Amino acid sequence: IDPKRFGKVAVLFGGESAEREVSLTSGRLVLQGLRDAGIDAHPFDPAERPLSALKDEGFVRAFNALHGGYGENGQIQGALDFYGIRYTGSGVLGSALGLDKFRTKLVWQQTGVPTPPFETVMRGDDYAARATDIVAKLGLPLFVKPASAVLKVKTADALPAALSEAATHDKIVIVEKSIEGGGEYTACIAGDLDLPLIKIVPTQYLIPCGLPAEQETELKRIARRAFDVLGCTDWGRADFMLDAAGNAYFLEVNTAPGMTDHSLPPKAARSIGIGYSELVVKVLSLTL
Amino acid sequence: IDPKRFGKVAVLFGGESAEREVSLTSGRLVLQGLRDAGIDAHPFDPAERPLSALKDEGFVRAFNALHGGYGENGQIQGALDFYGIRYTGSGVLGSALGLDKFRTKLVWQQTGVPTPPFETVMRGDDYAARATDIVAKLGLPLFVKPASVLKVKTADALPAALSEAHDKIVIVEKSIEGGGEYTACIAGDLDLPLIKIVPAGEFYDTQYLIPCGLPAEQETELKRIARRAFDVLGCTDWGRADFMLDAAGNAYFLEVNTAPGMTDHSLPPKAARSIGIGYSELVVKVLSLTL
C-alpha cells in the first residue's frame, strides 16, 4: 500500500507499432491511475527516449502499456531483463510463446488444454491440394490465421486463395476448425482478482456472460491453466469458444491487453467494483 | 561474398555468465576470423560497453559469441531486436524455448520428434509417492533435470534427488541406455557430419569423435531429423541438436543449443574442418545468414 514501496516507476507506452495510438491512450490513463495512488510514476516512450535512460535515471520498475511489436513479443521484455528493470506481466518466454499461435496450440494439446483441431500449411505447398486434404480432415467452416487479419472460410472452393494469401504473411499458416453453435468468451487475468468472464458478441461485450455460476467458475480455472502452461504470468486474457454443449476450446492468449478506459480488463474490473486506479496498482504490485 | 556488404560488425563476447571465459576465447577467434575475411568487425563485450553504443557507433549487425545467461536466453536477442541490430542465430522465441526443457519436450512430443519419456514433479507434492510412481511408470535409471542434472540409478535415491529441487517444476527423464550419445551441428545449409560424444571413463576428458561410427544411410537420416528437432522449436540457422541412440539405433533427442562454442576445441569448427571448411569460412557463413 505505501506508494514509496514502488520507487520510481516508468510507464512504457507509445512505441513504434501499428497500435501506437491505442498504447498512447492506455499509457496516459495508467499514468493517471498510478499518480492518483501517489506512486512516483513517469511517462517513458521507448520510441522517443533511450532505453538506457531507465537505468541511468534510477527507474526501478515499469508498467508495460505497449501493445504490438516489441512491446508484446518478448523483445522489450528481454531488453528490460537485460537492463535489470522489473516490469508488469509476462516474461520473455511467455510473451514470445503467447504470440506464436502454432506453438501455443501444440503446448495446449500436450497439457490437456482443449483447443480447436487444426492443420498447418507451409508457404510453397500445393495450396489447392492441401485445401482438399484439410477440408476432408477438418470440415467447414475454417479459420485461416498466420502462425505468428484472420480469414473465415465457409466453402471448400474459397480455401486455396485464403491459404495463398495467408502464406504471403507467414511461412506457416494455421487452418483451424471453427467452433459453431455456442459462443465466444474471454477471461481477463489480473493477479488472483476474480474478474468475470466477458461474452463477445458479433464487436459488443456482455457482462454477465450468460453462463451459470458453476460453469463460469470452472472456465475461469481452466483459462488460468491455459495461460500459465505457456509461461505467461500475472496479467493478460485467454480467449475461448464454447460449443452448443458447453465444451470449451481455447483460441489464444493476450499478454498485453488494452487499458483504455473502455478496454476489457477495466470493464471486467469495473463490473465487480474495482476502479481503474485500483486495477493498475494491483497489477503493478505483482512486481514487488 | 563482398565483405563490405556486411557493414560494421560487432562480435558480442565475454558477458557475465559462468561461461564468460569460454566466450572470451570464442569471441577472440571469431573476431580474427571475420577480420581475416576483410570484414569490418570489432569486439563488443556487453559486460563492459553500454548496448546503446551499438546503435550510436553505427554497428549494423552482430556475431553472437556469448554463451549462457543473457547471451543465450533471448535477453540479448530482444535487446538487439529492440535496437534494430541484426544478429546471428535464433531470435527471441527459439532462444527462450531452447532453454526451456519442459516446453521443448512438449513441442517435440506433439510434432513427432522422438524424445525420452518423462514425468514432472511439482514441489509441491509428496516427493516420496511421486518417486515411487515415476519409477513404476518410467523405470531406471532416471535423470532429474531443471524444467526452465542428477542421474539416479536406484529407486531409494530419487525422493531425496527430487527434494533438492528450476523449482516448483522438476523434470524426471528416462535415461537412454546401451547406445551412444551424438550431436548434429547446424550452420545454414552446410552438410556438417554428426559427432559422437564419449565420456572419459569409456575412452580406453570428454572425447568428441568424427566419424561418429554410424552407417552413411543412418547418419543422413539423423541429420535430417535433428534439423527438424531444432527448427520446430523456432530455432534457426546456427546451433546443435543433441540426441542419444539406444542399442537398436532408435534416436531420442535431448536438447538444443542455440549459442554453441567457437573455440578451437569446440564442436562446430571440428565438424566444419572435417568437410574442408576452415574457421574463417564457417564464421562468414554464419554471419551471411544475417544478410
Numbering used by the authors:
A (entry chain A): 4 to 151, 157 to 210, 226 to 311
B (entry chain B): 4 to 151, 158 to 174, 177 to 215, 225 to 311
What does the paper say about this structure?
We used an “ortholog rescue” approach to maximize structural coverage of these gene families, which are likely to be essential not only in B. thailandensis, but also in related, but more virulent, Burkholderia species, such as B. pseudomallei.
One strategy that has been employed to improve success rates is to “rescue” such proteins by adding orthologs from related species to the pipeline, based on the assumptions that many of these will have slightly different physical properties that may improve their solubility or crystallization, and that close orthologs will have structures sufficiently similar to the original target to be useful as surrogates in drug design. By using an ortholog rescue strategy for insoluble or difficult to crystallize targets, we increased our structural coverage of B. thailandensis essential genes from 31/406 (7.6%) to 49/406 (12.1%).
